[PDB]
Design a protein around this ligand. Sequence first.
Ligand SMILES: [Zn+2]
Ligand SMILES: [Zn+2]
Ligand SMILES: [Zn+2]
Lengths: 600, 59, 167, 47, 100, 57, 187, 107, 231
Amino acid sequence: MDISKPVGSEITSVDFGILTAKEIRNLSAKQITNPTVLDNLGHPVSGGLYDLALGAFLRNLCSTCGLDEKFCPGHQGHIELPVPCYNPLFFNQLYIYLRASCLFCHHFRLKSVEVHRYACKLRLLQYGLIDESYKLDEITLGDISSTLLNELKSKRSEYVDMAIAKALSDGRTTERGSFTATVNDERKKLVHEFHKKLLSRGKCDNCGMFSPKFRKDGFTKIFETALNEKQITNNRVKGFISTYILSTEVKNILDTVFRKEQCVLQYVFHSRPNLSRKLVKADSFFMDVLVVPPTRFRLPSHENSQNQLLSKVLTTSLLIRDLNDDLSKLRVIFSRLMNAFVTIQNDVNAFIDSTKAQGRTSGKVPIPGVKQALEKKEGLFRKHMMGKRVNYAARSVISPDPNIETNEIGVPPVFAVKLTYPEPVTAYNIAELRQAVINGPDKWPGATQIQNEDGSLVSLIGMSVEQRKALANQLLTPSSNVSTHTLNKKVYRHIKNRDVVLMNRQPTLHKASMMGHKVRVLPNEKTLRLHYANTGAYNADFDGDEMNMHFPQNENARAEALNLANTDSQYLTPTSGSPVRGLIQDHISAGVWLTSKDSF
Amino acid sequence: TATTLNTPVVIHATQLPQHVSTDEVLQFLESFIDEKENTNLSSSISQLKRIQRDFKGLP
Amino acid sequence: MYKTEKVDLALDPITQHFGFGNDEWPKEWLEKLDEDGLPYIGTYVEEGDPICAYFDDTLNKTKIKTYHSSEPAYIEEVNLIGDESNKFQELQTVSIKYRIRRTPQIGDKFSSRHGQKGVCSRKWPTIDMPFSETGIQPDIIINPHAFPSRMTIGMFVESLAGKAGAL
Amino acid sequence: TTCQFLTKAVLDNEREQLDSPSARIVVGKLNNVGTGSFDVLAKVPNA
Amino acid sequence: PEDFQQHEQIRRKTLKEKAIPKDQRATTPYMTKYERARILGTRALQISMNAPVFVDLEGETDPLRIAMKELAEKKIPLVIRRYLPDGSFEDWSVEELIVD
Amino acid sequence: KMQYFLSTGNLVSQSGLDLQQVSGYTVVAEKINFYRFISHFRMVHRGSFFAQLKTTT
Amino acid sequence: NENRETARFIKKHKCIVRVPIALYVSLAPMYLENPLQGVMKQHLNPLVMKYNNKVGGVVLGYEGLKILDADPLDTSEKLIKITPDTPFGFTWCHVNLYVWQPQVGDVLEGYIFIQSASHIGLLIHDAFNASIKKNNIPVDWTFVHNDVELGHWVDSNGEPIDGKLRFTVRNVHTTGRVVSVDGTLIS
Amino acid sequence: DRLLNSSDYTQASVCRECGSILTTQQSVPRIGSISTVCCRRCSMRFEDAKKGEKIFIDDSQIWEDGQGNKFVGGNETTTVAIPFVLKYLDSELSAMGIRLRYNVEPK
Amino acid sequence: GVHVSYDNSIRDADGTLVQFMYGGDAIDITKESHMTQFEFCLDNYYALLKKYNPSALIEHLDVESALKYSKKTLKYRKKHSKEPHYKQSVKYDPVLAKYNPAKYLGSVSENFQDKLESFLDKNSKGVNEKKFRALMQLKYMRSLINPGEAVGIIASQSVGEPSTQMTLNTFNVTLGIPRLREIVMTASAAIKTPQMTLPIWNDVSDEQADTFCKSISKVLLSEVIDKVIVT
DNA sequence: AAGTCAAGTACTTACGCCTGGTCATTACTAGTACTGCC
DNA sequence: GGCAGTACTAGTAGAAAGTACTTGACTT
RNA sequence: AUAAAGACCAGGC
Ligand SMILES: [Zn+2]
Ligand SMILES: [Zn+2]
Ligand SMILES: [Zn+2]
C-alpha cells in the first residue's frame, strides 16, 4: 500500500440478496450456448465458456472492456436454461414449504388466526421490542364465525401499531429497528417453531380437505405420493359441499401459495423492517439462468476449471433445445425428455454441490466446482481470508548472540539487501538518504527502488553509479505540476538500526510469542541472531529451530511495534503474573561463583 | 488527474438554482479576479477576463 | 553436493540442434559453452549462466537455456545420450552433473553419535580459544550445561575411551 | 459450515454491520478492539 | 436538491445528539497507551509528509522519535475522538491529557 | 503399466487385492549415507492408513 | 408483477446562475495551519472553467468559503478529520459557484471565429467554443470559397454575414476537450 | 496493514446504488474522450429507455461497450480499498445465486 | 471481540455487555504484583513517591468524594460481620461502581482495603500514615487496565498456553484437556462422571455416614445372585 | 386423528508452519489412411 | 491394380467420535 | 526474455 493514494470511502454495513431473472438478464454481456472450450489454431471461440467478451484471455484483448489482461478485471457471464429448477442450498427449505401448502386453496393447512399471529409477532420481533411479544399472545378476548376473527385481526393490528408507535415515540427503538443477540435468539427459535409446524398435521383448516404429501427421493426429484382409500372418499365428499410429476409445476404451486400468504413470508424471510417494500416470490430462489465467473478466475493452467461441468450443462441444454424443436414438427421421445430433465437438474446440482450427482466409478475425487472449491479443508477461507501470504518478510535459522541488550537482534546483509521500506523525502533526510541512493541496493546501506510522484516505480538493480548520482542530485526537487505538488518521491530504504522488526515462531500460542524488536546489522553470516533471555519467551531452542521474521510497512506500524508490542513492555506475561524472561543456564551458573564469599 | 487527491468524492448542489442577473455576475467577476492573483490558474483567469469584458464591453 | 540436471531438447522433423548456426549472434557467452553445444568441464556456473545453447531452424536463432538454482555449482561431467535405431538419429537428450563446494559454515546441525543435536553459533579464532598445557586448542567446545537435561553420559565415558585410545 | 450458514444468512436477508473482528478482516477499516475503537481528530486554527 | 437536504439535517442533528458537551464528559483523564501509540504513530506519519513543525529539531531523522518529542512538549494540533458503544463520543484534547 | 506401478507407487488393480491401503508402496532411495542404504533394506511399515487413524495403541 | 418490478427499479436509484454545493475533499499536511488555501489550490483552482457533471456547466469562480465543522458548538479554531491511513483530512464544506449552463433550445449570441465550407467555429462571449454542422445550414444559404487565400457564407438575402451571429443551442458536448455548443437553424 | 495492505490491497471500483464491484467496468471511449467508467448493471439499453416533452441527455451519460451496444445510466461509483479475494467472493458466491451488496459512505 | 470500553466495562463487538467490570477491579495481571507487598513498598516509599509523583495528580482528581463512601461501607461491614448476603442489605454497593475509577482517588476494591487496614493494625512505624495510604491508593488508581486492551484474546491464549504443557493422561476422575475441552466445547450435558460434593453435618459421625452411603448406593438384581441353575 | 417420544442417519468434524522429491500430462478402442503382396 | 494386414490418430469412458434434524411407532 | 494448480512418499520444529 502507498499512502499517496487515499481511499475516499469505507464500508459500514453489508447486506445480502438473491439473484433473480431480470437482474442477470441485464447483468451479463453476451449469451454463450455451445459446449466448446476453443477451436483449433489457439484462439477463443465465440459463444464458448472462454468467450472473448468475458475478459482478456491468452494475450488477446477483451471484447467488452477493450483493455489488456492487467487492466481488465473481468466480466460476468451467464448461460440460459430451458426449464427453471431449484438450488441445492435451498432445497431443504423448499421441502418444508412444499409439504405444507394446500393444493386446492393455495394456503397453508392451518387457519388464518394463528398464521397471522405468528406473522404479527415476527412483525414485533423485527424491531428491538420484546416486552410485548408475549403480551400479544394473551389477546384472545371475545365452529367460529369469520366476523369475530376479522375483528380479532383488527384489534391485533391496532395493538401492534400502537406498540410500534409508542416504542418508536419514546427513545426505545430506532426507525431502522434494533438488532442484538437476544432478539435473534427468539427469532431463530420462533421461526424454528414455524418449521415445527403443520408437518405433523393433517387436513387443512381453511378448506375442509386433505392434500397429497410429497416424499423426498434423497437428492434429485422430490416425488409425489399416491393417495389411499380413506382419502379418495374425501375427494368424493369435497364435491358434496411415488410418481414423477413435473418440475415447473412446483413453481406454479409456490407462486400462488406465496401470493395468498405474502404478508406472512414478508416477515418470516426478513430480519429487519422492510423499508423498500418489496415482494418475495418463488422466482427468487428458483434459478432460471446460471452465472459463470469471468475468465480471470477460469484460467486453463487441461480442464483445470469448471469447464468440464459447464460444458456438460450446455451439452444437455443443446440436446434439450433440440427436443422441443423435434416436437415442433409433430413413446421414447417422452422418456428421453423426462430423463433429460433429471440429467440437466442433476447436472447443475453437480456443478453447485458434490453430494447430489449420480457419478460413476471411483474418480480419485470429483473436481471441486464452486462450493467444495470454496471449502478445501472445510472452509478454504482459512487460506486467503484469515491467514495471508504476507510480503516484506524474512525467515532463517536463529543463532545465539550475547552483547545485544535484550531488545535488538542481528540481521545478515543478505536480509539487509532484499527487504526495504518506503520513506518520503523531506528536509530531515537530505543528508542521510542521499548516501542511500548513491550507495545502491547491493552495498549497505543504500536504496533499492525510488517511487516517483506519478506512481511509476523505478529501481536500481542494473543501473550505474553515475546514474545513481544523477538521481541523487535530482531527488529533492519540486513536483512537475500543482496536481502532484502535494507529495514528493518515497525512496525505499532497506533497513537501519532505527527500524523495528517483529519476530514470530510457529506454533505461536500466547501474546508474548510475537514481540517487536529493534534491529542491528551484523556482516558475519546469513543466519538470524537472538538473546539468551529472549529465546525463553518464544519457547524456542537452538537445535535447528526455524522461526519467521516480519517487517512493518508503515510509520504508525513502527510506533505500535516499538511502544506497544515491544519486548521490554512484554516483560510480564498476562497469564499468572510470572515474568517470562531471565538468563537460563550460563549467566546463572556464574552467579553462584561470582557473588559468593570465596571470590576476592 | 482523476483521483481523490484532485477531485471531490461526493458532490451535491445544496439548494435549487436561484437566478442572478448581469449585475451580480459583473460584481462576482470583478471581485474574485482581484481576489485570485493575490501555475495552471493563470490559464483559467485569462478565460475569466473574456467573460468579464464581453458582458461589460466589446472585444 | 552433486546436482544432476537432465535437459531434453525439441520440447516430426527435428528443428532444435545443439550448437550455433550461421547468422549474427552476440558474443561474450563462449566462456562456458563450446562450438559443439556443450559446456566446458570445470567452469564456474552461478545462477543465470549458459549451460546449453540450442539452434532452432523455425526461428533461425540460438537461444540459451539458462540455469536458475540456489547455489553456484561447478560442472564435473556431461553425458550424451542418443536413442538406438536402425536409422541415424541426432542426440536430443543431455545429462549434466554439477558439484557444489559446501564449505562448513555456522548453523549446520553438527552432532555426535549419542543424540546431542546442536548448531554453530560463531567460529572463534584459535588465539581467542583456550589452549591446553601441551599447547593444543580444542577445536570444538560443547556446553556442559546440557548434560543434566540431555542426560548424555555416553559422551563422557566415550571421551575417556577416545583419548585413552589415541594416546 | 459456511455453506449451511450462508443458507440461513441469505434466507432471512441478513444485514450485518461487520463489527466482529472476523468480519473486520474480510474488508474492515482497521479493527474494533484496541486502537480501532476510537478515532483521530485534528484541530486547525483557521476556519 | 431536497432529498439530501433533509438527509444533511439528519446527519447534523444525529451527530450533535451523539456529541456530549464539554462539562459532561466522565471518562478517564489519563493518556492511554493506545492513544499514545496512535498519537506517536499518526504524528510521525503526519510529520513525514513535510508538516509544519512546532518544536526545535536538531540533527534528528527518526519521525517516530520526533513525535515522541512533540508529545513530550505537547505541541501537536490533534484531539482524540473517543467513541462510546452507544454512539456518543468525547473530544479529549491531548494537551489536557497527562502522561507518565 | 508396471513401470507406472513402480513410478507413481499406487497400484491400479482390478481385483482389489488384499491390503487395505492404495498408495505408499515404493520409497525414493536417496542413497545419501550407507546407514540410509541399509535402513531401506531392513524397512518395516505398519501402513499409510494408520497415519490417519488417531489411536495410541 | 411488472408494476412492482418498476417500484424495485425506481428505488434502485434512490445564462449564468449561482448554485450552492456541498463537497467532501482532502487536505494536505503542509496546509494544516492554512486549510482554506490548501482546498483552494487543490480542488477549486483546477475546477474553474472546467465542465462539472453534477452542476452541469462551466464553473466561473467560487463564493462562500465556509469549511464545515466536525464538532457543532464561536471560535475560528475549527477541526478536521484525518483518515487513519493518510495524513490528509477529509472535511465537508459548502461553497457557492456561478455556473454557466447553456441548455437545449436557448438562444445565445456568438462571435465569428472560423468560416469553413461546412462548419462555423464561433466564440460565444470570447470564452467558449461552438460549432454548426453542414446539416444545420439553410438551403437558401450558399458558401463561397476565396481563391486568393478560408471562405465566406452568403445568407438568403445575398450578402455576407456580420460578426455578431446569434443562434440557438442544439447540443452541449462534454466528453471533448473544451465545451462545444452545437447550433440549430430552424425551429 | 499487514494482512491486507501488503498483498490483497487493491483499489477497486464500487457502485453506489447497486453496491457491487464485479459488475462495473470501463467502456470503450472515443479518440478524444478518455477515462470512462460506470456500472452496467443499473444501466439500461438506450433504445429501450425513451419518453412532459421529449427529454434529452448531455451525451456524457451515454457509454458504449466493445460489442457496439449503446447504454444509459449506472454512473454513481467510486474507488474503495478492498482485498481482491473479497472480489473473488463476490464472483464465486454469485455463481451460487447469492448476491452481496455493499453501501459505501457517504450514504 | 470482547474488550474494555471507556465506560469501564467489557462487552462484545456489536455492543452487548458481558460483565460490568473486568474481574470487579479492572486491574491488569501485569501490574498487580506489588499491590500486596505492603512491607516492600513501605521500605521503598521514597522511590515510589518519586516516580508516581502524587504532587502532580491532584488537579484533575477528586479525593474526599470516594473516601467518604469508603468510610461508610467499611463502617457497616464491620457493624454486622455476622451473616452472608442472603440476609444482607444492598444499600452500599462497592465504592468503585457509582464512582469513576481513574478519576476519583480512594475508590478501591474490598479485599485490598481489608488487608490494607489489617497491615496497618499489625504495625506502628520515619514516614507518616496519611501519606503512605495516599501513595498506596494512588498506586491502586494507577494500575487499572487501559481502556481498549484486547481482553478476550488474552483470556483465550492464557487458558490454552498451559494446556500445551500438561497434555497427558493422568497426574480419581478424568483430568486434563479431555475434560477442559469437554466443559467448553461439547455443550455440557449428562457427563461421563457425575460429581456432587456434600458437606457433612457436625453431630453425625462415621457410623452415621456409612449408613447413608449404603442407603443410596444402588444395587442391581445381579449383585445378589451367586449361582443360577436353569434346568 | 394428532401430539409426543424414541430410533435411524447424514454429515459434519480434527495441531502450527516450512523444505525437498516425483509425476503425469488418460487408457481402451475403433475408424481410417498408407504400405506391401498377389 | 485390387485386397488386406499393420500402425497412427482422434474420440470417449476396510476405521476414529459427537450432536441435532427427520421420521416411524405408540398411546390418548 | 518466463514459470500455475492439485495427487503420493520421505524429512525438519
Ligand atoms: Zn473485459
Ligand atoms: Zn386447504
Ligand atoms: Zn450500479
